[PDB]
Amino acid sequence: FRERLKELVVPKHVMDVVDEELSKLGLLDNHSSEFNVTRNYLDWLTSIPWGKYSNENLDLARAQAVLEEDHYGMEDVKKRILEFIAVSQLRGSTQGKILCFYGPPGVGKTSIARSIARALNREYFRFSVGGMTDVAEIKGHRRTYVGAMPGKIIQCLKKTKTENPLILIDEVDKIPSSALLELLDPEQNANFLDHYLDVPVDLSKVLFICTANVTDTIPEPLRDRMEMINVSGYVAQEKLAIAERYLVPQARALCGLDESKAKLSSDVLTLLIKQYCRESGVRNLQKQVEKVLRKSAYKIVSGEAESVEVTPENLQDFVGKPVFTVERMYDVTPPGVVMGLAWTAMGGSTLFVETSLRRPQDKDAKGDKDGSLEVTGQLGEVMKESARIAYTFARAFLMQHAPANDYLVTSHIHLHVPEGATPKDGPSAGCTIVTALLSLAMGRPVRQNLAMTGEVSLTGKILPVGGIKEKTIAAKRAGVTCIVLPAENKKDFYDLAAFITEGLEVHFVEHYREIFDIAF
Amino acid sequence: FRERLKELVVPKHVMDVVDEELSKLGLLDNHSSEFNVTRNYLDWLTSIPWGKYSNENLDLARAQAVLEEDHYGMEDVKKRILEFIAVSQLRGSTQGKILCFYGPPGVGKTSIARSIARALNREYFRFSVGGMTDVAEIKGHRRTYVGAMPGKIIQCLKKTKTENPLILIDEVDKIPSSALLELLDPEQNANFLDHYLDVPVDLSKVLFICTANVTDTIPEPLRDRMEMINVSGYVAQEKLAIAERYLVPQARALCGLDESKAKLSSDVLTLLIKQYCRESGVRNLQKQVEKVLRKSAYKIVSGEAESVEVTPENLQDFVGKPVFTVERMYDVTPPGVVMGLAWTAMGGSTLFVETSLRRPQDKDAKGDKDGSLEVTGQLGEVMKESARIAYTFARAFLMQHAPANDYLVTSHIHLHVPEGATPKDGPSAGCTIVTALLSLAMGRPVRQNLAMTGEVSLTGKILPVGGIKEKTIAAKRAGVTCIVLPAENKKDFYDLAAFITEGLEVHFVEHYREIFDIAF
Amino acid sequence: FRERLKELVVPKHVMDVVDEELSKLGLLDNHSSEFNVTRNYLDWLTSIPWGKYSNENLDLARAQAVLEEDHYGMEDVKKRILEFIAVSQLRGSTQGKILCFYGPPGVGKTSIARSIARALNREYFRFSVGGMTDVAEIKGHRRTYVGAMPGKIIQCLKKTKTENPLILIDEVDKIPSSALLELLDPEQNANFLDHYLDVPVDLSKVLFICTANVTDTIPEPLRDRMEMINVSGYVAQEKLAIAERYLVPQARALCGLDESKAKLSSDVLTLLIKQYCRESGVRNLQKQVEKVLRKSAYKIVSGEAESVEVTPENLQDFVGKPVFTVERMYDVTPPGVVMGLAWTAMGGSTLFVETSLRRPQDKDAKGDKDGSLEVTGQLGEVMKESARIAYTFARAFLMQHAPANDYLVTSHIHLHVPEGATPKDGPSAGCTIVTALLSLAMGRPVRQNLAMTGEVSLTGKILPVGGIKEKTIAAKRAGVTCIVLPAENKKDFYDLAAFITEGLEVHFVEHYREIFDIAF
Numbered sequence A, B, C: 001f002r003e004r005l006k007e008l009v010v011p012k013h014v015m016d017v018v019d020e021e022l023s024k025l026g027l028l029d030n031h032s033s034e035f036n037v038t039r040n041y042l043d044w045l046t047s048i049p050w051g052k053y054s055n056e057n058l059d060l061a062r063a064q065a066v067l068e069e070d071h072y073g074m075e076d077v078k079k080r081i082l083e084f085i086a087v088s089q090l091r092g093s094t095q096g097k098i099l100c101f102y103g104p105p106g107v108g109k110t111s112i113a114r115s116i117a118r119a120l121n122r123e124y125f126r127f128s129v130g131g132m133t134d135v136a137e138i139k140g141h142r143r144t145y146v147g148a149m150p151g152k153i154i155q156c157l158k159k160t161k162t163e164n165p166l167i168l169i170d171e172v173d174k175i176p177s178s179a180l181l182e183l184l185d186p187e188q189n190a191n192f193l194d195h196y197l198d199v200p201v202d203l204s205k206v207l208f209i210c211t212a213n214v215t216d217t218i219p220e221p222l223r224d225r226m227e228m229i230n231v232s233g234y235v236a237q238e239k240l241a242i243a244e245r246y247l248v249p250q251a252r253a254l255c256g257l258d259e260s261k262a263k264l265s266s267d268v269l270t271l272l273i274k275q276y277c278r279e280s281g282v283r284n285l286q287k288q289v290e291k292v293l294r295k296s297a298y299k300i301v302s303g304e305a306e307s308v309e310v311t312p313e314n315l316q317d318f319v320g321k322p323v324f325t326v327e328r329m330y331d332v333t334p335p336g337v338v339m340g341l342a343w344t345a346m347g348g349s350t351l352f353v354e355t356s357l358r359r360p361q362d363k364d365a366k367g368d369k370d371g372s373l374e375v376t377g378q379l380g381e382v383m384k385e386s387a388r389i390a391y392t393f394a395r396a397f398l399m400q401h402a403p404a405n406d407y408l409v410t411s412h413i414h415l416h417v418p419e420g421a422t423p424k425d426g427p428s429a430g431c432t433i434v435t436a437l438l439s440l441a442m443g444r445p446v447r448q449n450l451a452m453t454g455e456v457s458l459t460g461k462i463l464p465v466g467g468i469k470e471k472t473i474a475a476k477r478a479g480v481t482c483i484v485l486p487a488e489n490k491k492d493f494y495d496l497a498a499f500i501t502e503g504l505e506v507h508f509v510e511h512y513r514e515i516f517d518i519a520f
């Protein structure tokens, strides 16, 4: 091509390489593998827009409106993109900074990235690195191998044709970390130089967005040079608002109907949200709404009616009987059972820690006859030592609260902590395990709707934990009233919306004597 | 021919390159290493259509009539396809979805794919991805390679000559998966970019069907993309209906016979179903049918008989003595063996959990040594943990129901849980294990036809399980008369057809105390 | 082409190679794979410098100014570079010594490297051999590869184009090590012998600089040729000075502001340091400062205000509630817990060891019945043996100091050493373990703000430890006043800056009896 190279602002290096390329095309003859190689290399080097970028949209109020009018919530993503706009304005050129959205699945991480692109007026392009093993798919490979293609980044640059295409590397925590590093690095950016080509490409001003469900698996070489932002799950009422304003409209558009035919009530949407779904995003809720509208469309095209109104009285005919008929596993907990607030890789959960005697306690202690503890729940070494520490503090606390009670000392116990949480949050069930052992020993059940979370140590101190937002959302959607937290987490509980702290009686504690007071 | 491309309807983007390569092809004479094959590079694209989307019928009445004519049951698939047609008619265009049918072997998935194709009037094309590893076949190679094969999707487009051919991938749970992803991903769908053709195709209109036996093997990036529909097994009377109405006609028209030439009886068909087959599908049933029919054919053509008619008494002259005389391993179960339903990759099943004693009891054991338990059955870690939990609960439940009994606490037992259940349905034999240990310890057997299933917790809560339809079918076909289910599975049992749940006596349950009260 | 060599010194050795290869190219015909391959090999052979040296600055005062004016502290590195320039001067040219910086992350182990490249007027280059595993990325491939590119230093010479480039090997802990030796070995520095270049490549002039968090996981063969220099962390005052001189200006410039619009007061900077960061470097502080500055930029551009002055009473707006609202775990320690002063891979850190008495005292029953010690903290074998040594010594010391006390000898204890230290510094908690055991046994706490370290042997001899600078910095950060050290560490405690050793009363000891007399 001639105008392709003409209209762009290309550097002397690529000018030299394309000059030698034209020369080689002038030295070879038709019908030759060499000429095919040279011509494909030429078209590759010619298809990239150098110095050609897209004029971004920098009105603060217009960006705010674009962001807010097609996504509920996500206030911190909105704030961050607004700060990005403001810095790119106070500077001259474009910025091109790296981000990472982490949170449960189905909360809006990819759609918010599309909307960020639509607000920046930049082009868009995405790809995943969950099912990726070859460095080739990122950095290409030389023109010598038979099947030659340039590693999806030059493929991008072609497919989008602009200097700052807002890439989206989905699912970076489930991965070729070498090429990923070489791509996400302010100092290793300005020249990339994939294997296929031999010219270095200048991608310093493209803003990469990444996604992940959990930070703790993004390799630290990346995690260091990548700014983390949380996109948390929703409570029933935010799920309802999301539903009414975005889920049902575009489902109707997808199934070809309109509002004057298929009407979903707020009552049936809450019935869906509370009975037919359990996640903390809106993925399965959207599946159910699509099912409702498909069966509506059928009952219309057939002719069973001309307009369908879905109300809790006739819901079953569209989807069926409710799948989640209970709120928790236990309504009123027996003695050795306590409710904790696990932080999983899909949001939160209210997991039940259960203890039970394992061998008859009929023994007058003729001699030493120590007790023991058996533990299950696929525990690692960190969690096994946490359970030992919690066992020992339980012994030592019942040693002084009621010395006559030799249950925990001379008795064989089986403890079960279910397998939800992530290894970082694993040893956050310390106070739950302590309460479970103590309730089994005393023969008294815990307070009824009481969920707790926090780390415990031999001396009894309650150390802080993470994931307070997700744990609180899970306690909320599991029907919890009281909630015990480490008094060093009073920050990230009093910054949640008043939606999530409606009727939660929260107790911020420093030592386990306080948890023992409240829980009894 | 230029006539063909000219006839095609507006692939203008492709036509640019089509000219830029075809004028060069025709520019160079034959006897040219490049031209010989660049004629193929033209013929392929010329054969691949671009604008023709074959007529699709949107008649709900006729589509229902054709669906219910050549496939018994499968009303889930039939409802889904009817909703599909209704939606594709409400939208003025064809749409194209991505559906995946899962179920045991021999339930009709491929055959109903054929029926769907001929019912929507779309073309048809199937292929397998069972043991394929290379991406050379799902996406094709490039010209640099010595071979020349444009994959399978381009092959389909050529063979059918339409852009909505309803491709059918088989054994998708046995796959290399990146290409399947890029194929069935509506994000990466609108453009495909095979290797042998650098031109994109609009697959956003074909109706992808996948068939899998077990959904769990389907990698997650696909499992969340395809819509998973279940096709269940077949009770005996449904098997008989299928054989009478479809299998015997197919085998006849396979061996050139007629209703007067060679006839099979309903009584001999039931006899065959019950004695010569054990599966949940109808594959072995059709194999027996076609063997009987080809034996009949040999007899007739040799003239050893005329007007051959198969009866229960001359059936042994065709297939010999039965294969499965006995219903199941036991009819009267001794102490320590109970019948548990399982959900294997082959569908439902009925297995027997067995317990035995390993070391003699008689011992005035000084020191009060602790009883043990050796679990065999080729278990995973999850099943080992779950058997520990069931063991502890059995000991604890006996400790308070029969305080004098010390069988479980101090004795060395061996538990064999037979190995059929999928890794997901592993810890579903929990209540059968508890019952086996308890019946061994109490010396008494459980009541006769008392299959059961459900997860058990450390304090006894019976937790819901999956695969209820398959398990109910396999309890039906084993002489089971009382099945014991977790209470939260009513929404799964009370929606089975009237003939499936016909003779059963079902006890839904929430805590093991009641399973104990209805087993002893 | 030749015009490169037309003015460039090349060795008589490689000259025969290049001329023989030009001949063996001139005999063969173009439009050939072998033509392109030999051409590429020659282009690599010629793309590298062979005699040209950067006219390195040798003005001692110039290099000293260049250093001093872009880094606070690092006296050791700056002195070493000044002496290196001195020897470079007194010789004709220099040899490019090997060097290694070690210390906590975020202290400047890279920016000082680039400043050194500046003051030597060489260029810069870097690469990390942490994440890699194969020696390919360093040693390149032979001529007989499918299609290859050379080792890393070849790309370095291509993108630097002088014989002494000052490259930087990074993350030398996470490592092939033999290859890095053959690279960093004087006798064979002058001979690389990349399989991609048959001629020996000299490297006897480039100075390599490596980086590390800890010098113990660097393999000894490499460590023999590396001259170790330490770059420690900082204290509150040093962090404040770096933030005022470097961090705030660099961030403001990055954001596109000026001095008058956005300013951060000394109070708010010490607030950020002491409150929103718990590191030893300034890595997180950089993020916490440019976050403030981009929120400032938002307020400015978006018209919220035309000037901003971030102050201690409006910082919570810019960042949020304080993150770290506790200097340490216990303000006043119970009996049985002592501060630890460990030296983790991330830098110094104060740790608390606890003891609990996991089992009742038994009321001086007649039996001999020795006590025990369960230990948690994810130890190694050396640490478990050091714990047993501390246990024995504590029992013995209590025997000969309060012979009437039976606690340690007949009692079952639970010790927990937190899992923070390094493997080599593990047995630097012996005196903390002894203090904790004796504190629990006697039944009374230790001096309030007292931290200790040092190894202990059976006879109670305190043995010297390492990491005194980092332990002292940590002890300062955690608000410790009294610090107890081995008497053989006054060499490296008294060479410490007056910043660090100011507020601390420091007790050097030789035996444990003095630690006792101090702690009680």
Ligand SMILES: Nc1ncnc2c1ncn2[C@@H]1O[C@H](COP(=O)(O)OP(=O)(O)O)[C@@H](O)[C@H]1O
Pocket (backbone or CB within 6 Å): A070, A071, A072, A073, A074, A104, A105, A106, A107, A108, A109, A110, A111, A242, A246, A282, A283, A286
């Ligand atoms: N706050 C929200 N506003 C509007 N739509 C939302 C919101 N949160 C989730 N959704 C919808 O939920 C669906 C989840 O898909 P997606 O966000 O792509 O999954 P993931 O978050 O794993 O990328 C999207 O279709 C999106 O439209």
Ligand SMILES: Nc1ncnc2c1ncn2[C@@H]1O[C@H](COP(=O)(O)OP(=O)(O)O)[C@@H](O)[C@H]1O
Pocket (backbone or CB within 6 Å): B070, B071, B072, B073, B074, B104, B105, B106, B107, B108, B109, B110, B111, B211, B242, B246, B250, B281, B282, B283, B286
């Ligand atoms: N419900 C049914 N109605 C009619 N034919 C059936 C039915 N179920 C199974 N078949 C017969 O079984 C065979 C289909 O087996 P197939 O579905 O290919 O096995 P798989 O289930 O492993 O894909 C066909 O001959 C089909 O006619």
Ligand SMILES: Nc1ncnc2c1ncn2[C@@H]1O[C@H](COP(=O)(O)OP(=O)(O)O)[C@@H](O)[C@H]1O
Pocket (backbone or CB within 6 Å): C070, C071, C072, C073, C074, C104, C105, C106, C107, C108, C109, C110, C111, C242, C246, C282, C283, C286
């Ligand atoms: N002593 C110092 N003098 C000046 N700036 C410093 C100093 N220490 C750290 N910095 C700044 O902090 C950042 C440190 O990051 P970096 O040095 O790359 O981490 P590492 O030390 O692990 O290589 C740099 O931006 C640097 O400007």
